Design a protein around this ligand. Structure first.
Ligand code: GSP
Ligand code: GDP
Ligand code: GDP
Ligand code: MG
Ligand code: MG
Ligand code: MG
Lengths: 392, 414, 392, 390
């Protein structure tokens, strides 16, 4: 059941223009967005028809659309030519690649193809061809303003843009000219075509109807206090739930065999049969463990702080389940509950237990004002499985 | 352990929860902490005796050998996992201890000058939570912050003269002209960037971090947990009293006045605050009088000096000619007559101001209740007119029915 | 279209000079700014008559009217020149286009035409003609000093600057000089002609009466709201409330067939008839749905966080109403009330309901300290309309 | 010793580790010794590289940046010079392509790149343009190689990062922080041939390069990091072990550094040390244990006292210097404006004006404060104040 998630994105991406796959981390929001674009436009690498791009806290508008940047000129002293960002190198590219297929009697198809070469150039722009780039870009926005709205809706090559971790960067500052343009109506060819004049280069700029900006928002960090007006109306939000249905015996077998080889799937069958036999011969164990621990998360804390299902999807033995519970669940669980202990043991329903087979044991020396400090406790073997069999 | 007191009420050490030695250790720190911070709060006819009584471990609580007795200082304090709360004796009943909490905070709403909302308190009514004054003032801080952070984040503008690899804002020219060509690859700008971690956001990240560590509800732990995630990028600070003074309330962060004053009320060891029950009734009656006395304007704290100045709690005068002295007393007024200490001060306040004098007193089921009209007319053999007025308290509810009865009795008095 | 939101913009912009269309997101603010200027200037693209720019936090004062911007010359790569921004290139454009039909410029009508060419020139200004541009600019402000105020009251073009999301930038810093020019009797030709002196170039500057500024701020966010009281006097705020009356049966057929004037009017009408026939033949359903949410949001949230009428405007079928509910406005409602479940159950008028045909099912597992949280339910079919009929 | 069997496991299922712990534990030394025991390179350089971070560290020195350069005593010529991470990721790529059977189509030119990438200070542009020509051949080659050949690269490279919490990790990695996931690296399932902003040449982390962090978490906790650091990395707590301070364990540790004749003097000095302390071989073990279990219950677990301070005690006067200039300054730093809780960490509460490490000042203040002052003890009186910490 993953083709409906490649259809839930596909039905919203032609109706609103761009989506945001918001959900708790370790779910597959990066994997769903990357394996939808590769399945749609058959290009396994970034570059031509889609460009992977992540956000960070120090990411700025001048790296995204355009900004003044010092650039060397043929192994010599620097100049101060304005460089287009990662969006404007694909928003202009989605326009000039779509303008190949348009059969109009005003298109400079020799000139547009020259602009397409200078836009897909992986090397930086030398000043012998940077002025040829800015002159041809000036011809493009003199041509786009002359084309009617009837011939600027049917552009064939669907360009994509995987914005990874969209909420980590300051969303209203990055999308400077893109919180008035990213609607389906404010693109080129729509009913409300807007060609926005840019501050730095001074050339007009407008998003084409090819570009779809898929976002993968983690929401355990920099939470739902978003822009709530501009960066919330444009994006059609898709919740990617952490599904424990992929954590049964057959679903772990089906996932790890399709991507596998001939000799790998027989060994993955023997490893998973050894793992679930050590758990009590429960074929639905990791499903029931993740579903039970997700209900305790959404009751105490928010419903978007749940432990995802990319962690337990790559286990083959009890020892690998131990190294994913003590380094990708319990450090993640102590991150959400801000070093709290009396409520982090209720998630494991070990509230009235201490010093035994517990993941958080109480130290036997209280503080001066009666305070108590708990400590994480490593387990191994059947003691750890007995510590997992009472979470259910 | 959670211990609760009413004003001038006692609890037994044998019936009390926790340990006998643990509570008496908590109190001697609290009465000592009240000694060093006594002078910040104002009083009104308190008979405090600052030199001897407060430093003898009788500042807030009188800790005895067989019991624990409360003085007339209302509020709460959390010390050494022994959370103490002192409610007024007027709200004492005959969810069983959830009506006097919302009564006391509403009397702390109108008198003390807070601007909290009634729908903030009505959300908690009926959710069967454990009654605690620290759990609700943390909630009143956390809800009023999360309702003022959900709209806007308070990103305030500072200017930085920063050497940036890109060009943002105004380019500094005197720092770029004198730039050697071996270091020409970075612009030197002066950009007015908006920072999320301003001083008001460093405080609210620290005020939440010291609140989630010391909260006990299941509602405040969820609300402060969302507030701490919204403030994740802010570098933390150690809270002081210099931080709460260094910020000023302009028009661009005026909507953060309501969470900050509650963050200053709870944070600055000890936690919480205490106020005198005599002045808090002296302030609460002042809200009732000026609203209820249209014919004559009333000013609180007017002073006339005999011979050492004895000043009334409130005086109402229409222009300047009528002298109607109104001295607010928290006393129970037993046996339907004023005491020796009360009527002696009423005699001085009338003589140094042909001046009638009215004394307002509390009235509920717990406190002494007189009849509905002006209960006691008195003359002090000098043609005086001492009127004992009593304000009923529908402040445990949300409707002001008794204000109409207080106006009708005052209209017969005026 | 011309009834209220057009005739009250045109009357107020001609009286005050500047209009801000403040309102919640999802309302026709960018649209009524775009429709009014295109229906006035008869130019469906930016450029000559009007310029559509948008503000952001990376927007500079130096890139708005005047600043030092390092250009790239041929032999001297790092050359620091003073470059006029977009407002000084529209204020000087509105001046020298309006000064074609005057009678005191009889010595330099060729110089005004030469200055109009240099401002309409989209090519970057070469330094051999930039001094020709600066000599003509300081000739212009010598010419308006000798022009009477009776002849500068009527300039026959009408230039516009639609700034979009004006409130996002630092409006006290972007409008550096413009915090004392932007008034009807403080432009050129007004009762107090003010020609202020710019910092960088040292040339005097004054906004012509030809210009108009149509801001469209957003007022859902509050940390970027326009509280500058000395700046709120310069503008003339027009509250565009989110009108649910654009969601009736006759109004959706009149709004969606006005723009799309193709032969699909028979297709839209039979689809909109089928959509409302599945809604119980209620011609005022979506009007009542947006009204009974915006009133229930106004009473608990602020009055400026209301759902606009741009979400439910593009609906066509119940499957399309299901897509615009669970993916655009229900993640929006979970953003307004983020883990405040008793409010968001009440906004949808499901306060007593906790099971069955409901959007938010109650979890059957309470917490340690008495807390309890809810869970979404993806509804479909006639049960979804049965969960929408409870709202109205 | 036993931590090297935990780092070696976690550096295969994640790809990077952060060794966080209280200061003076071994975090730098465990990271240094594990890499030297694995790649047998005693010095930095070829198979691994050591790097610290700081508050004003830059993207221009880590991955790629602009740097000035003279051209035979002429005007300043700007040239793009690769930083630390790109010089160790490209080095992990061109060394891994030696043992590949499919990369033998350019084995001469790839070997020319590896010699050029390990040498220092390329002096002339004639080998720099040769270097930029060979790097464009490298990314043209690995862009058309299958995933089976690029999953198992043989020689493992390491990057020991010191003070991973100090650097602005959202700036100095930039948009390359999503090249550290194991499924995001080169030769993985979802590989990314991403482009660098300065020189435009593509870049991708090979699966050899493991990032061994090191985190002094006395100031910044693990929850106070950036959000793209608690999920890309995997945290190993290097706990302060007091078991390295026995009578036989302190002798075995010091026996590795000294000679045979120094060892008998080391044996006689340690026998003179523990005889003065009361003939207790388990003394310095239970000193830090009775401190740390009183530290972790009044403060966080990440504020404990490590065991690198007491690893050089030879006499009581050396332990007098360690306890007064290296450990008790840490306890006064962690407990500011708070003299009661530090008096309970030493379990000397209620005892003042004697053999106490913080005597009570007689004065009270304007409103009344305790405001203690530390007391420098000496001789057997200091041991009489250290014996009652046990
Ligand atoms: N025909 C017509 N369309 C309208 C009307 N009001 C809104 N719309 C539609 O709403 C859509 C977007 O509304 P828009 O004005 O762009 O919101 P906005 O002002 O940009 O919202 P914000 O994020 O800046 S705060 C447009 O496609 C437009 O067609 C109207 O009154 N008539
Ligand atoms: N085969 C398969 N793998 C999945 C699926 N969902 C997630 N994964 C795994 O999840 C990993 C990616 O996790 P990621 O998207 O980066 O998590 P996040 O970005 O932090 O939310 C990959 O290694 C995938 O193998 C799925 O539906 N099918
Ligand atoms: N011989 C030996 N020395 C150790 C051990 N642990 C720590 N050290 C010493 O501790 C010092 C390193 O401390 P360091 O990790 O840099 O502390 P940091 O500042 O917190 O990083 C080295 O000089 C080592 O001599 C150990 O197990 N054996
Ligand atoms: Mg991701
Ligand atoms: Mg807009
Ligand atoms: Mg170190």
């Amino acid at each position: 059941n993953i083709k409906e998630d490649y259809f839930r994105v596909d039905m919203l991406l032609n109706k609103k223009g761009q989506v945001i796959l918001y959900g708790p981390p370790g779910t597959g929001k990066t994997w769903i967005a990357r394996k939808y674009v590769v399945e749609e436009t058959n290009e396994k690498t970034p570059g031509n028809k889609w460009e992977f791009i992540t956000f960070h806290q120090s990411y700025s508008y001048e790296e995204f659309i355009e900004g003044f940047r010092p650039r060397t000129d043929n192994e010599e002293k620097i100049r101060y030519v304005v460089e287009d960002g990662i969006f404007k190198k694909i928003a202009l590219r989605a326009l000039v690649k779509g303008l190949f297929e348009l059969e109009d009697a005003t298109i400079g198809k020799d000139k547009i193809h020259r602009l397409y070469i200078l836009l897909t150039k992986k090397e930086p722009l030398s000043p012998t061809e940077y002025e040829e780039y800015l002159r041809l870009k000036r011809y493009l926005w003199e041509l786009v303003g002359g084309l009617p709205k009837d011939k600027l809706k049917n552009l064939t090559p669907k360009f994509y843009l995987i914005i990874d971790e969209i909420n980590r960067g300051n969303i209203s500052k990055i999308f400077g000219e893109l919180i008035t343009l990213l609607e389906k109506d404010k693109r080129l060819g729509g009913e409300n075509q807007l060609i926005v004049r840019l501050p730095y280069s001074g050339e007009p700029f407008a998003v084409p109807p090819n570009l779809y900006i898929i976002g993968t928002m983690n929401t355990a960090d920099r939470s739902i206090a978003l822009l709530d007006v501009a960066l919330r109306r444009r994006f059609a939000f898709i919740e990617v739930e952490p599904r424990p249905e992929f954590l049964e015996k057959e679903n772990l077998k089906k996932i790890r065999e399709k991507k596998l080889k001939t000799e790998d799937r027989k060994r993955l069958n023997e490893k998973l049969n050894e793992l679930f036999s050590k758990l009590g011969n429960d074929n639905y164990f990791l499903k029931t463990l993740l579903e039970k621990i997700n209900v305790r998360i959404t009751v105490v804390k928010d419903r978007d702080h749940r432990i995802g299902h990319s962690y337990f999807l790559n286990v083959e033995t009890v020892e690998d389940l131990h190294h994913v519970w003590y380094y990708e669940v319990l450090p993640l669980l102590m991150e959400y509950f801000y070093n709290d202990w009396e409520t982090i043991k209720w998630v494991l329903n070990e509230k009235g237990k201490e010093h035994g087979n517990v993941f958080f044991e109480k130290l036997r020396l209280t503080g001066p004002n009666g305070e108590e400090a708990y400590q994480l406790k490593v387990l191994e073997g059947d003691a750890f499985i007995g510590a997992l069999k009472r979470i259910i | 352990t959670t211990i609760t007191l009413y004003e001038h009420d006692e609890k037994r050490y044998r019936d009390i929860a926790g340990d006998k030695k643990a509570i008496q250790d908590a109190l001697i720190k609290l009465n000592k902490q009240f000694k060093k911070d006594f002078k910040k709060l104002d009083r009104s006819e308190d008979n405090s005796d600052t030199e001897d009584t407060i430093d003898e471990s009788k500042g807030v609580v009188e800790v005895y050998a067989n019991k624990i007795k409360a003085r007339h200082y209302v509020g709460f304090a959390a010390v050494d996992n022994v959370f103490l709360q002192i409610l007024p004796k007027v709200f004492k009943p005959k969810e069983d201890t959830w009506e006097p909490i919302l009564a006391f905070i509403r009397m702390l709403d109108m008198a003390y000058g807070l601007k909290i909302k009634d729908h903030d308190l009505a959300y908690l009514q009926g959710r069967n939570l454990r009654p605690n004054l620290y759990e609700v003032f943390i909630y009143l801080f956390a809800k009023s912050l999360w309702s003022e952070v959900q709209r806007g984040y308070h990103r305030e503008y500072v200017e930085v003269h920063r050497e940036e690899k890109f060009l943002r804002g105004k380019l500094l020219m005197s720092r770029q002209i004198r730039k050697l060509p071996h270091q020409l690859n970075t612009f030197s700008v002066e950009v007015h960037e908006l920072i999320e971690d301003n001083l008001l956001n460093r405080i609210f990240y620290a005020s939440v971090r010291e609140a989630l560590r010391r909260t006990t509800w299941g509602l405040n732990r969820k609300l402060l947990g969302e507030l701490m995630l919204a403030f994740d990028g802010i570098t933390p600070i150690h809270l002081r009293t210099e931080h709460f003074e260094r910020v000023h309330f302009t028009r661009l962060n005026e909507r953060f006045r309501r969470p900050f004053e509650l963050a200053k009320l709870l944070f600055m060891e000890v936690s919480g605050f205490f106020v005198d029950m005599n002045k808090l009734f002296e302030r609460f009656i002042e809200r009732v009088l000026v609203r209820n006395l249209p014919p004559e304007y009333k000013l609180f704290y007017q002073e006339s000096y005999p011979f050492s100045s004895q000043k009334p709690d409130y005086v109402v005068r229409k222009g300047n000619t009528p002298v109607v002295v109104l001295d607010a007393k928290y006393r129970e007024l037993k046996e339907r007559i004023p005491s020796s200490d009360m009527l002696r001060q009423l005699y001085v306040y009338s003589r140094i101001w042909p001046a009638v004098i009215v004394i307002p007193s509390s009235s509920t089921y717990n406190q002494g209740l007189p009849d509905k009209p002006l209960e006691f007319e008195f003359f002090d053999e000098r043609k005086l007119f001492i009127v004992a007025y009593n304000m009923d308290y529908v402040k445990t509810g949300a409707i002001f029915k008794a204000d109409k009865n207080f106006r009708r009795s005052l209209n017969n008095i005026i």
